[PDB]
């Protein structure tokens, strides 16, 4: 049975409110979440991480932040559309949404703003740099099935040792987890553990995009192949996601229902803006873009999406009043026409499949990989892939980012090439006499990250035989937190500085 | 009169407008269109590289004009939601014509918040200083305050009050005064209508008409409107458009759109706390020292005063992260007292605010709530805005914009016939520098100059006066549309140091 009062959970993990609360009181809780996010440093840092182009002098080109804002507006429209559609069907009160219209919209909007919040400095390639660096260090595949005669893991405490013990199972998970950094999983870790934001359960469910655990080592079940596409949460947040599943009535591996909407807003906004920026960067003219889109659509008919959306924008751009630029006019109507077709479709799909979406078990996206709407989105991606993401300036930035994050990890390698007693001594005494380098390296790590390491390790049972395994897991999480929390420019700056090349 | 917001929340447009019935849902979709136009505008994106108080950092820990505008948007949202909730509790929502405009009402406020500072020139208050100073020395608007004077210090022949047989001197008077009162709020109206051609809804544009004084105003403003006419609100170049707007929004002369008080209140609130949070991040003073500076600057300290309920409270929560805890609850405690006060003030004065004639702010002195804000401001002035890094940036920004204007003097030091020849033939043989300088001007600005000039009657004796005005707006558009970093770059590039 569908009752959104049971999914839109306004409680918090810490210092929680309890007890009935009016519509207006519930409104205030979710607006509090809004203020927490908007004033978060993690949101402000998005204006200096890059979205496709190198982020140059005139802010003409999008950043992770301005992209998110554009995405947030698409998510707002879908939510408004779903709700409006439901009011006309008379299902509003029946679905328990009559006193939750605002929060429903707000949760979607903030989840849009908050994708990419856990993304490392150079996007897809920073993740790559992290996971590649730890794979050569941990070799999780040599921990697949029972000890290997010669384990290539660099760490004594993690080596799959002597054909015995369950720990081998914990080692199996730790090694896999640390080699599957994923921005979405880091986002949950960020809003809960690092920033200590104390969001509502509903809000955090909205950024839990995938439900596969990072330590998962096999093929995902046939029934959940889509919701488990990428890792969604880390080993370190397993207890927290457990409490979240209970609070949001999630089965294991089930998704929060508003996540499908944010996912659709991502899918829509994923590309068009990058073409507009490509025209700004003078890569091709708007005229050339129309023909690249005309060519890649192929099977052309009077009546198709192409005709109704992208051909429409091309004609409007030719002979307009409102003294607007041709390119301004083309892209404005490319954006609007795309929204007018793709938002209602996403909203309807949400409603048509609301039972499985509510249960969180619906193994599909709103813009289903089959549909004609997904074909329009594939159209934009095909052009962007062959003509924008391949541009040398973009590709070089990707090369540069990979070397920067890779090199940074080596600079902090000393902190990992240390025994437990050694690293622990560095945590208690601020100045360790015989470890001058590791000392100073330790203090560069942001205070929030060191605090989360101390807090996590202190919650462990001191005497357990798995303690050194857990400590190392948290030590690595400490470093990955520090790196992934940087901006593109900060990480570039620290790299050059710690190799001594700035003044 | 009587209060009906169906008459203020005007969803028509200036160009290619919608007319005809429109259901509640349709009107919502119109106002959601404005949202998409604004959020996707380059002019909002340029806000992430214009500075809000502190120099830009390599890790964006510090606020920019964009992050600041987002915080202001959230405060505006709350005040709007609060007014609507109070009004439903009073049973006045349908009574005031708002029951089908709840959405738009909130959205117009939210966007107006995001869109203040959109017209601000690069280095903020000081780019404004640079522009007005540079044109003051070229146009000397005070030398047209009365009868023509024998020695008109205006550098422009056609703008000197010639001899003494004209109402053309009256237009000269306005042009000279207008061009020396560049004001970001007035530039914002120009930007969203003429330059970006966003074709926003009348209500949405009325929301950013913050002040009602024309930039060409030369004397003392009336006692009944001294607050609404504090700073200039629109330029001579937009006079006719602001006339269409006043009609569409049912504004008397010098009257304000009612939702502007809400945006204005959100600005006043989130204006200062964030800068203190940043001051602590940059390790200028500790949160402990900051507490004591606030205790001391509150002077007359006592009881269960607003200090005790808001800042002393936030100090206590922080003693059990520390800086985050203090500022999280400092912002929150401040909102919880000041947003309802504004929502109350707005409803308590809704007749005058609806007529648009209320000569006060929603907060405005008197109140203990304004005393709280003044406390944040007084501490920020004595301890943050006085920091040398801030003051150096303000010095540098002033030189940059001043120098940039001097680099483009040649475009201004040209006759009409010469400048016009430069607009048609792109290559003018004998003007190599002026030619190349002219092309550096953004296409959107050049295009707005052409449209402006073409609407004029060619034969008129005032034509050369208008062209110089539009030529000057052309330069001011170009400069004010830049970001902090681009302007610094262009300065260095054109002075040749890269
Ligand atoms: Mn995205
Ligand atoms: Mn402001």
């Amino acid at each position: 049975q569908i009752d959104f009062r049971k999914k839109i959970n306004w409680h918090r993990r810490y210092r929680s409110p309890q007890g009935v609360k009016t519509e207006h009181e519930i409104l205030r809780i979710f607006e509090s979440d809004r203020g927490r996010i908007i004033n978060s440093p993690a949101i402000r840092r998005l204006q200096q991480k890059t979205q496709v182009f190198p982020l140059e002098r005139n802010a003409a080109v999008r950043t992770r932040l301005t992209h998110s804002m554009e995405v947030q507006q698409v998510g707002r429209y879908i939510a408004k559309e779903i709700l409006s559609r439901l009011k006309e069907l008379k299902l509003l009160e029946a679905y328990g949404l009559d006193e939750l219209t605002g929060p429903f919209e707000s949760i979607v909007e903030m989840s849009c703003l908050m994708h990419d919040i856990g993304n490392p400095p150079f996007g897809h390639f920073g993740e790559a740099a992290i996971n590649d660096w730890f794979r050569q260090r941990l070799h999780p595949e040599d921990a697949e099935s029972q000890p290997l005669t010669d384990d290539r893991c660099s760490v004594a405490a993690l080596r799959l040792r002597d054909g015995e013990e369950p720990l081998n199972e914990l080692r199996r998970k730790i090694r896999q987890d640390l080699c599957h950094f994923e921005g979405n999983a880091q986002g949950i870790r960020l809003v809960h553990t690092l920033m200590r934001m104390n969001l509502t359960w509903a809000q955090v469910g909205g950024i839990l995009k995938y439900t596969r655990p990072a330590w998962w080592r096999g093929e995902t079940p046939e029934t959940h192949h889509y919701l488990m596409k990428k890792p969604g949460y880390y080993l370190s947040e397993e207890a927290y996601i457990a409490r979240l599943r209970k609070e949001l009535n999630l089965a294991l591996y089930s998704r929060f229902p508003l996540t499908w909407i944010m996912e659709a807003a991502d899918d829509i906004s994923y590309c068009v803006a990058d073409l507009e920026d490509a025209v700004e960067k003078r890569i091709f003219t708007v005229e050339q873009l129309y023909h690249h889109l005309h060519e890649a659509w192929g099977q052309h008919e009077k009546g198709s999406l192409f005709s109704l959306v992208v051909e429409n924008a091309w004609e409007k751009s030719r002979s307009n009043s409102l003294s607007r630029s041709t390119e301004d006019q083309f892209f404005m109507y490319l954006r609007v026409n795309t929204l007018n077709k793709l938002v209602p479709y996403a909203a309807q799909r949400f409603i048509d499949n609301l039972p499985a979406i509510f249960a969180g078990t619906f193994n599909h996206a709103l813009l289903e990989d089959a549909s004609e709407c997904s074909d329009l989105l594939k159209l934009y991606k095909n052009v962007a892939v062959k003509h924008v993401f391949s541009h040398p300036d973009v590709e070089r930035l990707e090369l540069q980012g990979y070397r920067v994050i890779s090199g940074l990890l080596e600079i902090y390698r000393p902190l990992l090439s240390l025994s437990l007693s050694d690293f622990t001594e560095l945590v208690e005494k601020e100045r360790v006499k015989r470890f001058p380098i590791e000392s100073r390296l330790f203090h560069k790590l942001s205070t929030r990250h060191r605090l989360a390491y101390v807090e996590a390790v202190s919650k462990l049972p001191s005497d357990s035989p798995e303690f050194p395994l857990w400590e190392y897991y948290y030590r690595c999480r400490l470093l990955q937190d520090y790196i992934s929390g940087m901006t593109d420019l900060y990480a570039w700056d620290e790299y050059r500085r710690l190799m001594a090349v700035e003044q």
Side-chain angles (χ1 to χ4, degrees), chain A:
Chain A
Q1 201 209 300
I2 289 178
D3 177 6
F4 271 93
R5 290 155 300 187
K6 288 184 176 180
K7 291 292 179 166
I8 297 172
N9 186 331
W10 47 260
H11 292 262
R12 309 190 140 109
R13 165 63 176 91
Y14 301 131
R15 15 153 264 178
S16 179
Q18 231 302 32
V20 177
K21 312 279 170 178
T22 54
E23 181 185 351
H24 183 76
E25 278 166 310
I26 299 180
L27 180 82
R28 282 250 47 78
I29 290 181
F30 284 110
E31 295 289 311
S32 184
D33 272 7
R34 285 180 75 93
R36 295 164 192 250
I37 298 161
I38 288 160
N39 283 270
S40 181
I43 265 56
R44 287 198 290 290
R45 285 182 184 96
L46 286 180
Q47 54 195 350
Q48 258 161 13
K49 289 176 195 166
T50 196
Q51 167 86 37
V52 182
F53 287 102
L55 212 188
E56 191 176 353
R57 56 177 180 70
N58 52 254
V61 140
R62 266 75 167 187
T63 63
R64 285 291 175 87
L65 173 61
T66 44
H67 173 79
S68 279
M69 280 173 31
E70 296 167 5
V71 175
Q72 181 190 226
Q73 186 54 28
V74 170
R76 172 185 174 99
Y77 184 3
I78 296 178
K80 283 200 162 207
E81 186 73 0
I82 293 167
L83 293 179
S84 135
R85 212 131 192 162
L86 235 46
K87 184 172 176 288
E88 224 158 17
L89 298 164
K90 305 290 189 174
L91 298 172
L92 214 53
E93 179 179 44
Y95 287 170
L97 285 168
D98 40 331
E99 292 186 53
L100 299 174
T101 282
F104 178 95
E105 202 179 307
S106 175
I107 295 164
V108 170
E109 288 187 82
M110 296 306 99
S111 299
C112 291
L113 193 60
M114 274 193 301
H115 83 301
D116 297 348
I117 197 192
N119 262 69
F122 296 93
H124 179 247
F125 272 87
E127 288 178 15
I130 291 172
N131 290 328
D132 293 355
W133 187 92
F134 279 94
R135 274 183 185 277
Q136 74 84 26
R137 214 162 195 271
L138 304 172
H139 286 283
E141 68 283 349
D142 286 10
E144 185 177 358
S145 150
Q146 233 36 246
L148 271 185
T149 357
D150 135 51
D151 206 326
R152 282 188 289 181
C153 182
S154 174
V155 184
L158 270 313
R159 252 167 277 201
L160 263 199
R161 275 296 205 186
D162 311 331
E164 96 306 285
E165 298 337 54
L167 283 52
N168 282 358
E169 182 48 42
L170 178 59
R171 294 179 175 104
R172 261 181 272 266
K173 295 182 172 186
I174 287 178
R175 289 207 218 167
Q176 186 79 346
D177 188 286
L178 289 174
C179 294
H180 282 84
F181 181 99
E182 173 64 40
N184 291 285
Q186 186 68 22
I188 279 89
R189 171 161 177 77
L190 184 71
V191 297
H192 175 53
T193 307
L194 298 173
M195 300 297 120
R196 314 239 79 238
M197 242 172 279
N198 197 26
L199 298 176
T200 57
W201 292 111
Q203 191 55 76
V204 178
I207 64 168
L208 181 61
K209 188 176 188 168
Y210 299 108
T211 63
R212 169 161 102 187
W215 69 85
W216 188 270
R217 296 178 153 276
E219 265 175 13
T220 53
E222 47 281 322
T223 48
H224 292 70
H225 187 272
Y226 175 69
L227 308 169
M228 301 184 63
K229 197 204 291 191
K230 309 176 100 178
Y233 56 102
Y234 295 126
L235 191 56
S236 52
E237 283 80 54
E238 190 183 9
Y240 172 74
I241 284 304
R243 289 182 291 262
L244 181 133
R245 272 190 239 99
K246 202 190 266 184
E247 295 277 359
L248 300 182
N249 292 332
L250 300 178
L252 193 63
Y253 309 140
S254 286
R255 190 152 92 174
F256 186 64
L258 272 47
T259 303
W260 319 77
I261 300 166
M262 163 251 240
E263 188 185 61
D266 197 23
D267 293 353
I268 289 171
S269 301
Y270 171 87
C271 215
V272 273
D274 297 330
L275 305 179
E276 180 180 356
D277 288 345
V279 168
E280 177 67 18
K281 283 264 182 173
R282 295 165 55 217
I283 291 179
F284 41 63
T285 73
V286 56
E287 195 163 9
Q288 304 177 259
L289 175 62
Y290 179 65
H291 291 115
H292 285 140
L293 289 164
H294 203 283
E295 293 167 28
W297 175 264
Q299 300 88 31
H300 253 105
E301 136 191 315
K302 306 235 174 180
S304 64
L305 267 183
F306 191 99
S307 170
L308 289 181
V309 169
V310 21
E311 192 169 21
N312 182 306
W314 173 251
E315 285 301 325
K316 284 208 183 166
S317 74
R318 308 184 39 179
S319 186
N320 62 258
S321 299
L322 302 258
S323 292
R324 202 132 62 214
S325 169
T326 289
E327 311 79 81
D328 301 346
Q329 186 66 14
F330 173 74
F331 283 106
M332 184 190 295
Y333 276 108
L334 189 67
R335 193 220 325 143
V336 168
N337 291 353
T338 294
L339 255 49
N340 288 2
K341 296 292 171 195
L342 264 69
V343 164
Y345 177 79
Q348 200 54 45
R349 286 278 289 172
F350 181 83
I351 291 170
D352 286 6
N353 300 87
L354 192 49
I357 288 174
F358 189 88
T361 71
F362 182 54
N363 198 35
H364 307 280
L366 257 42
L367 291 309
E368 35 154 349
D369 332 87
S371 72
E372 197 181 13
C373 288
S374 186
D375 289 354
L376 184 63
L377 292 187
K378 269 179 62 177
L379 167 68
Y380 304 147
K381 301 188 189 191
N382 287 4
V383 176
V385 94
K386 285 298 174 67
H387 298 86
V388 186
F389 303 157
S390 53
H391 186 266
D393 286 339
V394 171
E395 288 198 343
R396 181 182 65 198
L397 180 66
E398 301 174 326
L399 282 177
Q400 313 185 262
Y402 186 85
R403 187 153 281 105
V404 164
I405 296 308
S406 286
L408 236 42
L409 288 175
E410 204 62 38
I411 287 174
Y412 291 81
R413 201 201 108 95
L415 261 43
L416 299 189
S417 251
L418 247 54
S419 78
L420 196 165
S421 41
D422 286 328
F423 188 79
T424 307
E425 191 178 339
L426 186 47
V427 182
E428 271 84 75
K429 306 193 295 196
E430 302 291 337
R431 295 243 102 75
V432 163
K433 3 265 148 343
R434 50 187 208 282
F435 293 127
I437 296 305
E438 294 88 335
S439 284
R440 283 146 182 90
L441 285 174
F442 184 67
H443 296 39
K444 268 202 156 61
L445 307 177
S446 291
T447 349
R448 33 185 209 274
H449 306 318
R450 275 190 269 110
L451 191 141
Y453 165 84
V454 170
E455 210 176 64
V457 159
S458 87
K459 288 196 182 179
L460 303 161
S462 327
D463 40 303
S464 196
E466 49 183 36
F467 185 82
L469 289 70
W470 279 115
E471 184 281 323
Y472 209 81
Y473 172 69
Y474 287 128
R475 213 198 293 176
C476 293
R477 217 111 288 260
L478 166 66
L479 224 189
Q480 302 194 9
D481 294 348
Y482 178 62
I483 300 303
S484 67
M486 290 162 159
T487 70
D488 293 31
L489 273 45
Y490 191 61
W492 182 54
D493 267 69
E494 276 274 298
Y495 179 73
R496 288 192 71 188
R497 258 143 64 207
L498 294 185
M499 302 288 194
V501 185
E502 219 310 297
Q503 263 133 17

